[model samples]
Target: DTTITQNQTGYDNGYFYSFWTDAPGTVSMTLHSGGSYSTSWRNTGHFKAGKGWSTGGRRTVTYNASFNPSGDAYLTLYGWTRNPLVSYLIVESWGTYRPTGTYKGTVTTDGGTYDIYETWRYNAPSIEGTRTFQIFWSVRQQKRTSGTITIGNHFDAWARAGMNLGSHDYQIMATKGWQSSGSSTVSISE
Candidate 1:
């Protein structure tokens, strides 16, 4: 069986939708964002599998929305873990949506060079089981007459597991490059 769960707190006026699938079976999962007037599967897609096996041996799912006031959302993905310790899940931006002309200084990860404005590491796992990771962001709207609005670019969420085990049900939430003062939060359930 394949299932996905989300627990959202605070204001609710956002949409809950996901792009995912269970390979072989191609099991489908859909979710309604919190505080929505109508319910629908906004976006749907499949998990890629090879020869009865999955690559990265992990199925990656992405959740996103243009959050409005009275909005809070949570998302989770669930599946059996093939690798326990060495396996990990990642949530990343599907594309570069940085505010126009916002320059990101030079950055590095594990000694590797990357744009400073956009980069982050995953929350380390405390224990193991059907894991639930949560992220919260404060959405603010800004209408600028001129000049550039400075927004912080950051990355969130990652995992680490040992060899011989495959991680399952990996989920992620990504944010836009520019916005007013805001924050991002994350949590995991084992």
Candidate 2:
């Protein structure tokens, strides 16, 4: 369950959608812009899908989310996918304070310390005249209240260090999994 809406200018609003099966979801989100927003739940994915994901496996996906921001805010756990034949898309954010620059040293899974970042995105094109798309986030950072955020499987870790996420089972995925009520802002005509 998620519902965040903050107004009076300068952005803030979040909403939720669900898809469940068996265990692993008690997610929650609620914001009011000045009530010190809230939401912290994590059981995490690949929970048992033949053991945490595939298709170039090198996983280190962990979770735990808690937030209390007063300024530039964040605390995200995301995975999204979509495509219309050559106009592909995928948005993946494994977070807890983003926007970083090189420092790939720190890897401990499940109760840990992570500082590996790859900021992601190069062949960027949403869905227009078919420019296609490519994005892979190899994120691992920290700044707690709730911990654990790991994702160490890179399909090739960007082809062994720089450029190459080409050829993917074709995209058409509206979304894939997880969320810790990261960023917020909405007012289409509110």
Candidate 3:
């Protein structure tokens, strides 16, 4: 188990792992040779795994995790893109308060329904450094710990709603905590 206290990112077992936080916290993650990882975080942080895919489409994400969050936390499919520069999240499970933005509509996929939303980040930290950008979201109505997410379905839905994404940078399955505590053991793959 490796403890992370600041912003860090690297490749492990042919997959990408990033630990990013603005607030102080204790976080630990372990990696396997097959690009699978398990992480536990307390305080404020975000950790994730994925390939550096060029596009966030034409892909199927299969994931399984025993996610347990005592406070504010999220188990989600997270990623970023360039050109137009956008950040997105597909929240599968959450703790305490549920998050939402300006409600756009809803989408159904993988036998579940997700509420769509759009938000903004003005000069916040991102994959391309500090830059203002839009955030597209699909927050699930019913939380689940494990499932398969067809990434293209969500992208199609967003495009129909005028939420266009740029060339994909890196898409990741992530666990995030906002001034909270939680433990999650997860394995994700393309």
Candidate 4:
């Protein structure tokens, strides 16, 4: 990854700063211009970004990667382009961060279930973004060479070599103690 400009920083592929700034937790994002990996059942003639989010610092970072379906196909690009723009986040929404004592042995979050691994990286980004926080990821367990895969639908093999969360918050910056934190529900925008 290269800096889009000085003072501005980035570690993933083509993910704008907003990708990290816009969410509670920014996942590393890699884009594969849509319409190339698979056929869109709803939105057509568009490309999408494949992404991952990793834990930062002192833990094994896990992974997730893919190009997922649009939240819906009910609308077209700009509402009338005749081409349904396959829209998705350049980055997964957001989360502040968390700790160890960590979590493992399987847990679910945001409507998905994962066989938790109580170590460092609980997640992964498909392309690139520097998220080095130690996390308990809710991710997929398989990897794909390519296809109509959504990241939350799958996962990765992690490493303990440092880590990658983000700087949008101050939690991951903390170097000690661990606890469980999260909302019991999730919400999406209209």
Candidate 5:
């Protein structure tokens, strides 16, 4: 296994892959051909792929994954944006603990329902270094290991709720283990 203990990003199999950690520990991420990747982590770390975007779109993402978490973790569509400097998550499956935010509402689409929430962070670690930003969340009501995510549908719902997004940046399929232990094998495509 390739062990990771710091922030790093590169292109793998023609796809952008990033491994980031604040509290480093045992973390390993292997990128396969196309949009497939697997990760095992015993600490706070995340792996994401698919690089950046100019604008969020009606992305119909088909994905399969084996997700197992013994502590706090999330399997999500995660990314960051510029202009307004926002971070967002469309959480599909979670383990041990699920995240919650200031309740916004709910959106039903892409074969499931998701809870919407928003929170602000001050001087917290971000894609653009330490700074204040907003985090928008679409936590799936029913967790699943494999499914389709109509990404733009969720973005639309958020916009309708006044949770507008910033200029699109690097949006990706991601698996995150936060001060936790878990393993995930994820394959996704647009």
Candidate 6:
């Protein structure tokens, strides 16, 4: 039961990084991107291995990747948007053979709460300047049993680029872990 932390430094228009733990189990990550669009994947780079994070039962370190944005804009691109645009970060986990439902929770950055899930829609809004938007996800799980844990993680970012139209970008980064119930934590800062 070691302390697990996933972090993203620097900035980008759009990007997503995710990986699995050494413990076998099930883990899920969801991002708020408003509008209509979504994506998913498994054993991919969108989700890769790193110092403490691993894929295929082993852990390794590597360079980070960046994503691009595609669409028009309705507002001016300025320096950093407002503080706390409202958004949600949902994290969940389950066992390999156990039929137990997905144990999940959501957090709202605007409200500032910890260890609690809110039903509110988390904000992934755009900045006043610059046609770039960024969102990230990280997870760490503890293994209660030893088996192959499947990781399903996805990130979707959306913004109102047109008068009444919106644009969205989705990416999936998946990996496998070997264990059971573990701890996972994620955070974002400018």
Candidate 3 — worst ten consecutive residues by lDDT sum?
A: 46-55
With candidate 5 superimposed using the best TM-score fit, by how many Å does residue 131's alpha carbon deviate from the native? 0.6
The TM-score between candidate 1 and the true structure equals 0.21
Better-scoring candidate (TM-score), 5 or 6: 5
lDDT: which is higher, 1 or 2? Answer: 2
> What does candidate 3's lDDT look like per residue over 1-190, in tens digits?
3445557677776777776766544776666555466667766544443322334555798888888888888888888888888999999999997889998889999999999999998978888888899999999999998999988889889999999998887677888777677788778878
Give lDDT tens digits, candidate 5, residues 74-170. 8898887888788999999999988889999999987899999999989888877889999999999989878888888888899998987777767
* Clash counts for all predictions: 13, 1, 0, 34, 0, 28
Model 6 lDDT per residue over 8-89, tens place: 2211223333333222223333332211111122222221211211111111112122211121100000111124322222
lDDT measured at residue 153 in model 6 versus the true structure, 0 to 100 = 17
Q: Give model 6 RMSD, 1 decimal.
A: 18.3
- Give the per-residue Cα lDDT of candidate 4 at 27: 19
Candidate 5 regions exceeding 4 Å error are: 1-5, 43-56
Best by TM-score: 5
Residue 114 accuracy (lDDT) in model 4? 40
**RMSD to truth, every model:** 15.3, 14.2, 2.3, 18.1, 2.4, 18.3
lDDT of 1 at 171: 26
Model 4 has an lDDT value of: 0.22
Rank by TM-score (best first): 5, 3, 2, 4, 1, 6
lDDT of 1 by residue, 94-143 (tens): 22231121223432222123232222225533225334433222111222
> What is the RMSD of candidate 1?
15.3
TM-score of each: 0.21, 0.25, 0.89, 0.22, 0.90, 0.17
